[PDB]
Amino acid sequence: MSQSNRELVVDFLSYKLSQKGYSWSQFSDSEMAAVKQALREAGDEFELRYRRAFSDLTSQLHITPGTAYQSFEQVVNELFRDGVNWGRIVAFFSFGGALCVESVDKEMQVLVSRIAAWMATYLNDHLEPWIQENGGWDTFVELYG
């Protein structure tokens, strides 16, 4: 179905994981992809602004293997209930990234593959209808350099 959002999710999570020294390979087995670069900078900036107003997102929620999934869906649903904009989509990515980074630090590597899967499915089922009806992913690159 060419849901290449998977590639976007993995690319973003790999970047966040690489920052902490890990590799995406450890947890899981037309070249206009400047969105990859655009999303990384955006994610970095979001986390920077978030960690200034509050504590960094990596220490916001207390996670356990059995708590993770219900906690992820609960957050995302409340984030997108009153509307969808490009800022909240960046919030969506940097949140999932913070979860992966935390889950590894708290030694719950099992979640990393799933967080990606959780993000990818929601990005296909509930967000892409908004994406191309707002100009696709390039529009994001244009508006946010």
């Binding site: 957050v75 995302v76 800022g87």
Partner: peptide, 21 residues
């Protein structure tokens, strides 16, 4: 009983004001 919504709102607070690139 969720502190998850508080996180979602904190996310929205920065996300909403994120149009000023």
């Amino acid at each position: 009983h969720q502190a998850e919504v508080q996180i979602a709102r904190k996310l929205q607070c920065i996300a909403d004001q994120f149009h000023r690139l």
